Design a binder for this molecule. Structure first.
Ligand code: NAP
Ligand code: NAP
Lengths: 325, 326
């Protein structure tokens, strides 16, 4: 039974803990916050939880694993300290702001004999295994993936504030916050791309409100759309020589249907999970309990591929964070 | 009084045009040109009392008011120029030309011979676009996503090692030129000319694009464009505004247009899809000739120029080069 520490008192932390408890494989025991009162307010719905407003003291406590859902810009430093203190780390997406940070995390992890995982919830969905198997004997000719929805932080932005998710100080933007999902889907299904491009509508601080990119593969390309000031409801498509696979989304996928060039249809057996994080939560605890180091190596590798793509795409669009300026 | 119609091109598309022309009550087919008189004969046989021709010079000397031209893309320019110099009005199938200077050249020739020239951009003329543009008139647009990608009937020939005209660098083929022009025309119709454009394609050895993705850049937003001929997409087309998303089932022969706001309220736009894809353009062209609104005609010419400029810019970024350009 895994002892769970948590950083970040956002709603997402509640969602993770709720999935972790439900799996029957974790037990929350500790919470860190910048303020004790915020930790208390967060923890009040739970029972017997140690509270911390000092990261140093937090990491010296007895737990096995820490879920980190702080702002993007803080992920690296907090995760590195967690690993140095011999804790396993589940790190919310996007795990890092630069590919080198990911490689440094891995080294730090190996040194301290701990697992580091990016909480790429869509990547672990059983749907993707079903979809990849289906395409195994097919020849892919292209794809079109998106994730664009109108942020709850839009009113604050429009009123002249700069919410963390739209700030260059906190490594935000549509590509970082949402575009990472279709990138993870592409890597899951197609592996590492050859190259990538991205162009975005940007705020004055260079952060992207929305954008369009392409991932380049040997005999095809994948259009990527990300957006936070717009709502898209476009399905996601994968083209093959014999037809088109239509996925309703590339996250928390609920249907996958193949149509051939004569209009004959095949419904892939998709069984959406009750919650968005159910499958990653099971996968992570399964890995720590019964290590498949080969599977672990691919998770690390695919995360590396995603963050290389993100970084290339930010560079082409001119999306620059404060520490890069 | 009926417009006497001559036709170049004996493909299925010419039969479809003629059918719409006759159904409108505004045209009467009188002449058909073909490279071979026998090809003209087979094509003409379903009609009545049609003159057949196998020489363009002789064709253009006969009595008809206007010519519909549906030859391969690379032949559009020279044939249309000859028609206009012969004093015939021209409906030229899309894509009208291979480079914007050709379009300007046709317009100059048309004006000096006091004739109309129309690009047969069937979607641009759909009443749906008037309804959509009126609805967007007091919204603030934040971007759009348009596509036209359908698996070509010429794919089996292609895959068998042949090279159909639509996939040939000698006939100005490719997904962008053949299908991509529809979303471009839709974008120009609603938003006007973009400030810049890019396109990246999957290409045959002759540089012709099987499919591709591009972006039209406007001052405060961008429009994703997808075109394809070796793939089939059924993605809807979206226009984003500050207050919601307008969803069109397509940007050609549009059937439905629904606006959904950020609170989930829906507004259905009144779209009345024509019985046929060409109904609306055929009525518009006849109406322009018989009861001209010349200012509107000029807008049609300008917008076509905008479309072909974007097309040409996009071919250049993707490296799509025709035989004449190599
Ligand atoms: N997998 C998913 O479906 C999912 C959904 C949402 C987001 N995520 C990710 O989870 C992470 C957090 O999301 P979020 O929207 O909750 O971010 P956030 O609200 O900006 O920050 C999250 C937590 O970090 C702390 N924090 C806020 N501002 C800070 C600052 N200036 N300096 C240090 N700490 C600060 C706060 O906790 P304290 O007040 O207790 O210090 C806050 O509760 C992001 O990386 C995001 O990408 C994943
Ligand atoms: N608006 C629409 O919805 C619609 C749909 C389809 C096509 N179009 C357009 O219509 C035009 C033709 O399409 P298509 O598929 O029918 O093209 P196509 O088959 O390649 O050629 C059409 C006609 O042009 C002639 N032709 C063929 N090869 C030729 C050559 N090497 N040299 C000179 N003439 C040749 C043939 O007529 P002859 O044998 O009698 O000479 C043929 O019937 C294209 O510009 C296309 O973009 C638009």
């Amino acid at each position: 039974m895994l002892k769970l520490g948590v950083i970040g008192t956002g709603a997402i932390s509640h969602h993770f803990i709720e999935a972790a408890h439900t799996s029957g494989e974790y037990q929350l025991v500790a919470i860190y916050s910048r303020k004790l009162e915020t930790a208390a307010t967060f923890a009040s719905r739970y029972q017997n939880i140690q509270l911390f407003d000092q990261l140093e003291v937090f990491f010296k406590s007895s737990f096995d694993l820490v879920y980190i859902a702080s702002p993007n810009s803080l992920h690296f430093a907090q995760a590195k300290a967690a690993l140095s203190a011999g804790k396993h780390v589940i790190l919310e997406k996007p795990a890092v702001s630069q590919p080198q940070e990911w490689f440094d995390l891995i080294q730090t992890a190996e040194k301290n004999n701990c697992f580091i995982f990016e909480a790429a919830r869509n990547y672990h969905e059983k749907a993707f295994t079903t979809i990849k198997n289906f395409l195994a004997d097919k020849q892919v000719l292209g794809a079109d993936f998106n994730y664009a929805k109108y942020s709850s932080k839009m009113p604050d932005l429009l009123a002249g504030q700069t919410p963390n998710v739209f700030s260059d100080r906190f490594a935000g933007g549509a590509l970082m916050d949402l575009g990472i999902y279709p990138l993870y889907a592409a890597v899951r299904l197609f592996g590492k791309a050859n190259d990538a491009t991205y162009h975005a509508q940007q705020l004055d601080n260079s952060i992207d409100l929305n954008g369009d990119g392409i991932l380049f593969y040997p005999d095809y390309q994948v259009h990527i759309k990300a957006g936070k000031n717009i709502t898209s409801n476009l399905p996601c498509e994968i083209y093959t020589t014999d037809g088109t696979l239509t996925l309703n989304t590339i996250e928390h996928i609920r249907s996958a249907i193949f149509t051939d060039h004569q209009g004959n249809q095949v419904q892939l057996p998709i069984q959406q999970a009750p919650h968005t994080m159910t499958e990653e939560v099971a996968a992570f605890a399964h890995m720590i309990q019964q290590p498949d180091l080969n599977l672990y190596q691919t998770w690390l590798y695919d995360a590396g591929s995603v963050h290389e793509l993100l970084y290339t795409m930010r560079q082409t669009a001119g999306i620059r964070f404060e520490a890069e300026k």
